[PDB]
Amino acid sequence: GSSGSSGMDAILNYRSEDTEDYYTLLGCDELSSVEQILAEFKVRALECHPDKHPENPKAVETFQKLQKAKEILTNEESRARYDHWRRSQMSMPFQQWEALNDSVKTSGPSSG
């Protein structure tokens, strides 16, 4: 004989997340390696690429935060600084601090 049929697993969790964590953007952590951090950035970035979806401008943002974070992480030097700022939970955002580190002068006027 021959019979059988099953597949009632129609349960998924695609909830959203309201947070601005450079680590969340790529869904990785200190454990994740550079190679991987890039792979996810490519798929996650392409899946929401602006060029592809010219009708959806907002997308640009998602790609802007994906390319930025991916960089700050990919580089052990830049990342190292990020973590430090976290453990210190400074009042100002990493962005600001970053500038201070490089130079104690006004760097990057374009904010938005």
Side-chain angles (χ1 to χ4, degrees):
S2 54
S3 271
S5 209
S6 286
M8 296 205 212
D9 322 310
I11 302 160
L12 67 83
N13 41 87
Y14 90 123
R15 272 288 280 191
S16 291
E17 302 90 51
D18 294 59
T19 184
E20 50 189 70
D21 294 323
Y22 277 39
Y23 280 104
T24 289
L25 309 172
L26 315 178
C28 76
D29 279 327
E30 58 168 82
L31 309 88
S32 292
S33 281
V34 175
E35 272 169 315
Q36 278 276 67
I37 290 161
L38 283 161
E40 62 192 11
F41 153 80
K42 284 152 190 191
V43 295
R44 285 161 151 76
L46 283 157
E47 280 181 274
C48 281
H49 208 275
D51 276 289
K52 285 288 280 290
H53 311 268
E55 185 60 83
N56 176 33
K58 270 81 170 86
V60 176
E61 196 176 296
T62 313
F63 187 71
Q64 277 190 283
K65 89 197 171 159
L66 273 162
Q67 72 180 26
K68 271 285 286 185
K70 153 278 210 90
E71 188 88 72
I72 303 293
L73 300 169
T74 46
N75 270 329
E76 282 157 70
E77 66 188 272
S78 46
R79 169 202 270 195
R81 289 282 184 193
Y82 193 69
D83 295 288
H84 171 80
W85 170 99
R86 293 207 151 185
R87 292 196 76 168
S88 278
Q89 297 84 18
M90 303 279 207
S91 191
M92 90 292 242
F94 176 73
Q95 290 272 258
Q96 172 72 16
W97 184 60
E98 210 289 319
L100 291 166
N101 156 39
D102 89 75
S103 76
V104 76
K105 270 287 179 293
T106 182
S107 175
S110 307
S111 192

